[PDB]
Design an enzyme around this catalytic site. Structure first.
Site, PDB file in Angstrom:
ATOM      1  N   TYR A 160      91.318  -3.781  -5.060  1.00  0.00           N
ATOM      2  CA  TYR A 160      92.599  -3.139  -5.321  1.00  0.00           C
ATOM      3  C   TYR A 160      93.049  -2.171  -4.206  1.00  0.00           C
ATOM      4  CZ  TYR A 160      96.175  -0.240  -7.451  1.00  0.00           C
ATOM      5  OH  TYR A 160      97.308   0.466  -7.700  1.00  0.00           O
ATOM      6  N   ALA A 161      92.170  -1.282  -3.776  1.00  0.00           N
ATOM      7  CA  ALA A 161      92.465  -0.388  -2.678  1.00  0.00           C
ATOM      8  C   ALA A 161      92.808  -1.145  -1.377  1.00  0.00           C
ATOM      9  CB  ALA A 161      91.294   0.548  -2.423  1.00  0.00           C
ATOM     10  N   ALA A 162      92.091  -2.220  -1.103  1.00  0.00           N
ATOM     11  CA  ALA A 162      92.288  -3.009   0.110  1.00  0.00           C
ATOM     12  C   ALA A 162      93.627  -3.736   0.075  1.00  0.00           C
ATOM     13  CB  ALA A 162      91.154  -4.011   0.284  1.00  0.00           C
ATOM     14  N   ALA A 163      93.909  -4.425  -1.025  1.00  0.00           N
ATOM     15  CA  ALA A 163      95.189  -5.116  -1.186  1.00  0.00           C
ATOM     16  C   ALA A 163      96.355  -4.142  -1.008  1.00  0.00           C
ATOM     17  CB  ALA A 163      95.251  -5.804  -2.545  1.00  0.00           C
ATOM     18  N   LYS A 164      96.281  -3.014  -1.690  1.00  0.00           N
ATOM     19  CA  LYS A 164      97.296  -1.987  -1.592  1.00  0.00           C
ATOM     20  C   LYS A 164      97.494  -1.457  -0.166  1.00  0.00           C
ATOM     21  CE  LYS A 164      97.412   2.793  -3.343  1.00  0.00           C
ATOM     22  NZ  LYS A 164      98.829   3.210  -3.483  1.00  0.00           N
ATOM     23  N   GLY A 193     106.621 -16.447  -8.209  1.00  0.00           N
ATOM     24  CA  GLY A 193     105.694 -16.210  -9.321  1.00  0.00           C
ATOM     25  C   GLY A 193     106.377 -15.602 -10.532  1.00  0.00           C
ATOM     26  N   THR A 240     104.197 -22.364  -9.179  1.00  0.00           N
ATOM     27  CA  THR A 240     103.423 -23.321  -8.380  1.00  0.00           C
ATOM     28  C   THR A 240     103.254 -24.661  -9.096  1.00  0.00           C
ATOM     29  OG1 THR A 240     101.376 -22.506  -9.328  1.00  0.00           O
ATOM     30  CG2 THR A 240     102.119 -21.499  -7.247  1.00  0.00           C
ATOM     31  N   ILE A 278      98.948  -2.273 -15.779  1.00  0.00           N
ATOM     32  CA  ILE A 278     100.096  -2.798 -16.488  1.00  0.00           C
ATOM     33  C   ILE A 278      99.618  -3.619 -17.641  1.00  0.00           C
ATOM     34  CG2 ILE A 278     102.183  -4.192 -16.273  1.00  0.00           C
ATOM     35  CD1 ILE A 278     102.166  -1.597 -14.587  1.00  0.00           C
TER      36      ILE A 278
END
Ligand SMILES: COc1ccccc1NC(=O)Nc1nn(C)c2cccc(OC)c12
Ligand SMILES: COc1ccccc1NC(=O)Nc1nn(C)c2cccc(OC)c12
Ligand code: NI
EC number: 1.1.1.100
Lengths: 235, 241, 244, 237
Positions: free
Chosen positions: D144-148, D13, D38, D177
């Site tokens: 966000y919390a879950a991915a992290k 990516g 991709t 960011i």
């Protein structure tokens, strides 16, 4: 005040140890308890155990890795007994084990949510894996399973909270079960050495915690993972 | 079951809110409840409240930041009522983000001071329950966030360490980390600020003092005998850290 | 027997004649951090709690071509902190990089953590005026090397403190971070016997002890302009061995 | 030697933002950089960007959710350029569950495939880049919390399994960011955001990149299983 009268509870993997103890505890608090196993003989054993302890309910065969089995099993419980508003997930290398366990928590949790949503009340409680496995592979797997459980539980709690459904987990430590009773002595001793309380936990001690999480008094506790490990924290 | 007859419980800061609710809950489970406050009128109020709810026990003036006060207060309880085997620490002292240090430093010193003093009695009895209550979210912006996260993380670490040091004696040490509980701060917020607050709580509501209390009640019991070193969040799904 | 000791060409290393204070720099991790910051071109004041230690620090910096000084500092003392900073300010300049590595040791877990955090706060607070005026700063707190109870406590105290401080001084472009070392090869660990070494290594995925230098590189990177968005963080440096 | 001369780095990516910045940073440190996208136009863009910055390497089409695509792509890099010993996973291929389930499956898929090369060389660097705060409000917080947390646990587990081979595995957990997501905020809405960040500013893609650049190096050889937050002091768990 601490009762579960008129509430239907589903307890997966209830034929032995922790699952069995949870099924008996929810029954004692007055719940109608459906315990499940993956075989017919296990379901009947569950049924005989509930009977001999004066708990109303049933033993049924459920395969938590199968949508067909989940869907049909719920239909059965709904037609015969009612909508389960308390659900305890206790039915289960490192990547596939965690991936698969969480897929099945999700599969089962999703299915029972329609009933809890309609009732505007619910308790989902996820039970973690016991400490016990051999060497560093055991340590890696255990830490991974636990961290997967802690994050999943919090996310789900966050998604279904506006409906007054709580989602919590219990992270057991070194517990006296059939699996642990026949550990080698040295692997047992090493493990006792890391436990401040200086002793193994009983299945029943996990069960009391689940019992309290199921109650009205734990209605503001959600997204939480309650460690039940005698002070032994393995990460 | 869950039953506290024959058990003496000390609950610090029991005059209002959470502390009061804990004192009544332990009483309901059958404990003999000594609630404490930092003033005479607060001790009086504690005593009237226990009486009017059929709970046996007392209201005492205790200053948790003072060794004299701790030592004398324990002597009084020992001579008159017995050795406290259940102890709930709930006595803590324009909010800015530089208040955190004083507050946490002071609160932990006093947990330690009080915990150390009651350990002699629990050691002799080979049984004990110490339960530390965390701070409610005290303010809404960044300063509120910083202070709350700090207090909580100080309490989590302290609790685990102490649990580890006194575990071989069958004394459990746990904490309860409350979230947004219905406090005068939360009552006298602006309206628009209140809905926004509720929006950050998955359960969509403020917690009741009583809900903290039930958790303490269960930790005090024999069924929580293998739970130690744990901090049980009671926050309706709202995690700030 | 002095309590302070010392140590055109224009260097072009990551640290720009930036002044760095490194507490407890006489041995091991602290010494390695002092040399690393020096190599990145910083002017390095290392401190010890005795005169001979300050002398040893000064000789070490000299023999490695690092500009700076060895000073006597007692981090548990407001008088010593205040006076020492004044001395650095008057003579050498305002420290904009500060590495806290001075922690004492031996109901003990509490006193060790309580005392170490009070001293992090004491020292951090004192250097903040200089960093505030310069609109730039790096505070880096070094955790304790590995027992289990004390280590988990110290680490959790450090993670929470670091995060709170980072939050309080961030608007001034000062970052605050910590490094949580694991099992580091030192004089204490070098003299472990044949048997006790394997057991220890067995609990470390990397299968080896860490070098003081490996902690130092991490500090070195946190000190730099490229770690300007990293703050409130505790970087574990433990070869995959996690004890909490 | 905080440099990367003679090392091949795969950055997934790499056509925009964080991935692009990481690709340029590893190049600057002297790595030979294969960046992937991709789509064909993305691979083209990656190749032109590396060229115009004096970085050796290539732009390739890779679909990280596909075993065929992973296997073939590695085969192509191995035959034509060499064995990637630095790999940065930055490709994104009841929303929370499917996103995290799928992201981790693809980290695993890709990580497993490059491990053969790193095992042979007895050296490796796998660095997983977390998700930027993707939206505001409650769904944003949850995802966000879950991915992290998924990334933190996975990273630690993998680090544990491959550590004896001197392969380190780490993650970078970015905060707010400066990318397309934040660039298109309203006026009242961005100040409010900055208010919750101690540093009082959005992070630059480049600042994520320097951290990756240090994790790739020999000096980060004892750091493994770690998730380095790069969030300006803004912690959402
Ligand atoms: C020092 O007390 C401890 C003992 C065992 C484990 C943890 C702690 N303390 C902490 O973790 N944190 C803090 N201790 N103290 C005295 C603090 C003061 C200000 C901020 C702190 O952590 C955010 C602590
Ligand atoms: C595959 O997941 C893991 C592998 C090794 C160690 C930990 C994990 N998992 C996690 O930490 N979290 C999650 N893993 N998976 C598959 C998830 C699915 C939905 C939500 C998750 O946690 C946020 C995870
Ligand atoms: Ni070709």
């Amino acid at each position: 005040s601490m009762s579960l009268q008129g509430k239907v509870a589903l307890v997966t993997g209830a034929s032995r140890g922790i699952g069995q103890a949870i099924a008996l505890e929810l029954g004692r608090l007055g719940a109608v308890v459906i315990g499940t196993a993956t075989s017919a003989s296990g379901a009947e054993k569950i049924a005989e155990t509930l009977k001999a302890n004066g708990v109303e309910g049933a033993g049924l065969v459920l395969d938590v890795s199968s949508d067909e089995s989940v869907a049909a099993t719920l239909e059965h419980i709904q037609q015969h007994l009612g909508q389960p508003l308390i659900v305890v997930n206790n039915a289960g290398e490192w990547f596939d084990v965690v991936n698969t366990n969480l897929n099945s928590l999700y599969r089962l949790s999703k299915a029972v949510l329609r009933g809890m949503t309609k009732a505007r009340w619910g308790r989902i409680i996820n039970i973690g894996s016991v400490v016990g496995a051999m060497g560093n592979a055991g340590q890696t797997n255990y830490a991974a399973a636990k961290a997967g459980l802690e994050g999943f539980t919090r996310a789900l709690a966050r998604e279904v909270g506006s409906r007054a459904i709580t989602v919590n987990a219990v992270a057991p430590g070194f517990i006296d079960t059939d699996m642990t009773r026949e550990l080698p002595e040295a692997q047992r001793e090493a493990l006792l050495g890391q436990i401040p309380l200086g002793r193994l936990g009983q299945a029943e001690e996990i069960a009391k915690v689940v019992g309290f999480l199921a109650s009205d008094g734990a209605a503001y506790v959600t997204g939480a993972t309650v460690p039940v490990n005698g002070g032994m924290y393995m990460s």
